[PDB]
């Protein structure tokens, strides 16, 4: 009945990947470079995912999807676009996986697969680190938008639980906001680790995302749960977030420009939030926290300077 | 206005301590005439790592006055002892103590309404006194009596006073979030599962809310400072002292011998069960809180608690 084109060889494309084939189902694995389809194909390893044998079947060719694969969106949101655009047929449907809004446009993944392909559209999103994921450790995502009962059946294991919701719009804002906040929440780490004040950010954080995704028309049920809450204290809180790792290393005085191009891995808070800035501007709508974000990151503000602003 | 801080433990102590620094106008009771002696002529607690402690300590309950702001900063299973001693009743009481007293299943408001019948106020949101004492950026929340008077004279550059009119909600936020900690804490001590953490974090603010809206409380309560804020700080910071206890737990220490280790107080121990009784007398299901008590007062071994609770 169906098959599942994965679209993104990192960490997470891999991982989600090789997990639908170990449910026994029609996977293949697209990567960008031939140097990661040999290393999945021959010696079932990649540099993304530690000590995990990967069986899942690699290919470099677009021109292997078919119009009646699922295709998974595991490719970076700034990425996508390029990408879908060389596609030679449109899918049946996507699933993303992606958390991002892209900066020049604005536009969340659901807009740029409405623009390029027209095909129905669903996003997975929760508190899932490709690291933990890979190691069969409990992990509960939501799933939002069309065929999402089916795609519930064929993605969930014993340790993988997906739950269903319909607000894609607030799931997407959600998981694309929650890396820009990360961010800010790394910074702490780098000070010492300000455990009250990170505590007192995230509360803050996960209302500032409310409110950005309510004014494009999200549920405020939905920053309360998996996908808005949850994420954020995963993404905030563990060792294995590179938009938490970004802001601990700038905090500590690595340059943030030079952060991003020591790692083959993207950091996707540190373009969102220059996404999330744009848009507040365009539409009138305060982002306190986005806007130090974006200062750090872009315009050099000192992290200690940007911690008082914030706080008055 | 003088505030009459009842309790010399961590807490106790550095709220004390911070009032006096400010200004205000502070005596300090403690338990022991040990830790009285200390405080008043060594200028240190063992409760206060590395910080002078200038505020007068007293040991006499007779030095209390009828003007006096009662802050009370007793562990709650002890408050009532103590309560039923005072010679005259303040004008009103402020609580700093989060929990449930297991003989009644009351909260500290009722206790306080019982025994001295005068207004009552509370402070609560995510501030670990090791932090405070050393002037980290810190947010809570205040609801009850004078509460716009209270923040006026409470907050400093670095502890940020916000208030709410949800005194019921803010009191079961502040005590439930400790069981959820233990449990947080038991993640830390397979290791690190940091995906079945915030999942759990999730779950546990939904619980904690159901107990609090049985009792009338605001469901935005849940969603600022006192409930996610403090739940966040408390399952995420080594500064936990509920955390810790769930993390040894999960290693095999057996649950008593940790409790009798150490001169703290380990208040989600005994809120949980203050909180089973409550829940079996009104049917309230609790599955977070049961399997806490179980692992803590039933022997019951932390993975099996983990599969149940999966399983519900
Ligand atoms: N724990 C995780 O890693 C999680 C990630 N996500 C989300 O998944 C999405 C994909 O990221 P993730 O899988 O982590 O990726 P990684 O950070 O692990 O790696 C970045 C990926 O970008 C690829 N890429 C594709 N085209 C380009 C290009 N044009 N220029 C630069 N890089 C390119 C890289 O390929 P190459 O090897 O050829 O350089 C690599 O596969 C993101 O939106 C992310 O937020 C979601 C949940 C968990
Ligand atoms: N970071 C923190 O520690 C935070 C704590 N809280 C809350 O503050 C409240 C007070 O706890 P905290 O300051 O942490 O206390 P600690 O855990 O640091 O110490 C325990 C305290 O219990 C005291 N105690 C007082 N009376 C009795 C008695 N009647 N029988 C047995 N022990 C007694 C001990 O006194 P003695 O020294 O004489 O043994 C000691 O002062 C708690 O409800 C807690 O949740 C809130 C915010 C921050
Ligand atoms: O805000 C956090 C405080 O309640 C301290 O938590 P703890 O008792 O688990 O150390
Ligand atoms: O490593 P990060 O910061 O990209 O976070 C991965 C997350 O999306 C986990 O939910």
Same mark, same amino acid.
């Given at each position: ?26 996977? #293949? ?16 390893? =990649?540099? &993304? ?29 700034? %990425?996508?676009?390029?990408?879908? @655009? ?34 129905? &559209?669903?996003?997975? =999103? ?10 069969? @450790? ?34 997407? #804002?959600?998981?694309? @906001? ?28 996960? %209302? ?31 060792? &294995? ?43 009138? #709508? ?7 974000? %974006?200062?750090?990151? &872009? ?14």
């Amino acid at each position: 009945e169906m098959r599942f084109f994965v679209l993104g060889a990192g960490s997470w494309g891999t991982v989600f990947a090789q997990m639908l084939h170990e449910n026994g189902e029609e996977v #293949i694995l697209w990567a960008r470079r031939k140097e990661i389809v040999d290393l999945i194909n021959v010696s079932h390893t =990649s540099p &993304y995912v530690e000590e995990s044998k990967i069986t899942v079947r690699a290919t470099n060719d677009l021109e292997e999807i078919k119009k009646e694969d699922i295709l998974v969106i595991a490719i970076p949101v700034q %990425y996508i676009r390029e990408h879908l @655009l060389r596609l030679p047929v449109k899918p049946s449907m996507v699933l993303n996986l992606s958390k991002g809004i892209e900066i020049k446009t604005g536009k969340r993944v659901s807009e740029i697969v409405e623009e390029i392909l027209g095909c129905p &559209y669903a996003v997975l =999103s929760g508190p899932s680190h490709a690291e933990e994921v890979a190691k069969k @450790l409990p992990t509960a995502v939501t799933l939002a938008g069309e065929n999402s009962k089916e795609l519930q059946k064929r993605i969930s294991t014993e340790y993988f639980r997906v739950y269903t919701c319909e607000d894609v719009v607030g799931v997407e #804002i959600a998981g694309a @906001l929650k890396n820009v906040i990360a961010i800010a929440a790394g910074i702490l780490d780098g000070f010492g680790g300000w455990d009250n004040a990170k505590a007192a950010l995230e509360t803050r954080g996960i %209302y500032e995302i409310a409110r950005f995704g309510m004014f494009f028309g999200a549920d405020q049920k939905t920053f309360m749960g998996l996908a808005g809450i949850g994420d954020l204290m995963v993404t905030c809180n563990s060792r &294995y977030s590179r938009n938490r790792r970004f802001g601990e290393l700038i905090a500590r005085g690595f340059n943030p420009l030079k952060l991003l191009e020591s790692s083959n891995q993207v950091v996707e808070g540190a373009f969102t939030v220059k996404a999330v800035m744009k848009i507040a501007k365009e539409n009138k #709508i305060d982002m306190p926290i986005s806007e130090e974000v %974006y200062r750090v990151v &872009y315009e050099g503000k000192p992290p200690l300077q940007s911690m008082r602003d914030l706080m008055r």
